[PDB]
Amino acid sequence: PGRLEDNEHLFQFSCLMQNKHRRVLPIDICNPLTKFNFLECICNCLMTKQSVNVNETDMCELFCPPTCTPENYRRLLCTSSVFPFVMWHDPSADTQEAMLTKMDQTMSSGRVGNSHWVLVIVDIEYRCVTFFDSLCDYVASPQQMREQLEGLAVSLGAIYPKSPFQVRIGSTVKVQSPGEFTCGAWCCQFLAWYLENPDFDLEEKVPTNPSERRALLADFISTTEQAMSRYSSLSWPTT
Amino acid sequence: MQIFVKTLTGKTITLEVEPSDTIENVKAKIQDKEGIPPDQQRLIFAGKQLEDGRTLSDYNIQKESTLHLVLRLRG
């Protein structure tokens, strides 16, 4: 289907984007950032950055990503301005342990299923939190989920002094169709388009034809995993 | 001695080891407790990848060192 669907390869993309755009932080694939621990770890992560601004050698150790070392996580914290979070929704589910036991072996079944990657990009330079979903409305409605992120946005405004954060719907035009498992790949493609231009509109970057759109995405996926094919280790990047 | 291997799922796993059990030995028993062999995962300790080949003694994995384990989660 597409090899930008595994958490490991989505992490490799996040590293690829920190190599091409140094202001973005890579993602942590070790805490379950499903709808349950969705906004808690954003507030947590963005706080341990503002605690990074003052001299700090203690909070970095506990809120560290496991794949990272806490000195490196503090250096990447202090210098980053763009923070992506990939969230895993299933519309058949509403408890963390069952959405999780579901994963615990959804990894050893290893088939994917009704899954769906979503993307939020928290950028402290714009004081903006964009939401993107390849199927737009598939994880929540577009103006409840927006509240949820207008709810997160004001909490962020409180720990990051210049006023609440801006909210932009990334997903306006439906870009996926049926039986396509390319939602990690569209999350990647939106992150690359965002990091090149945060005020892009995706409707001019997506062809209005559907098959031209799928051909563009498969060209992107091939270019991307060619750029990523030498990323071996999983650790967070050194530079 | 006990060590622990917290993962991508939080279902922390309690596993008794020895100071020089190997990485595929530990991966032999997480396949003996959840059924996933020593090629499908990757152990991580202190931001450093555990090489299939080595053994606890090399990394100072003392009693209860929180270890961590990356799966392959498809979404």
Swiss-Prot record, chain A:
Annotated Gene Ontology cellular components are:
extracellular region; host cell; membrane
User: Does the record bear Hydrolase in its keywords?
Assistant: yes
Q: How does it sit in the membrane?
A: Single-pass membrane protein
**What EC designation does it have?**
3.4.22.-
| Keywords annotated in UniProt | Hydrolase, Membrane, Protease, Secreted, Thiol protease, Transmembrane, Transmembrane helix, Ubl conjugation pathway, Virulence
Give GO BP annotations, semicolon-separated. protein deneddylation; protein deubiquitination; proteolysis
Question: Where does it primarily localize?
Answer: secreted
One MF annotation (Gene Ontology) recorded for this entry = deNEDDylase activity
Name the protein family.
Answer: Belongs to the peptidase C48 family.
Functionally, this protein is described as follows: Effector proteins function to alter host cell physiology and promote bacterial survival in host tissues. This protease possesses deubiquitinating and deneddylating activities.
Protein name (Swiss-Prot/TrEMBL):
Deubiquitinase and deneddylase Dub2
Instruction: Give the species.
Output: Chlamydia trachomatis serovar L2 (strain ATCC VR-902B / DSM 19102 / 434/Bu)
> What gene, per UniProt, encodes this protein?
cdu2
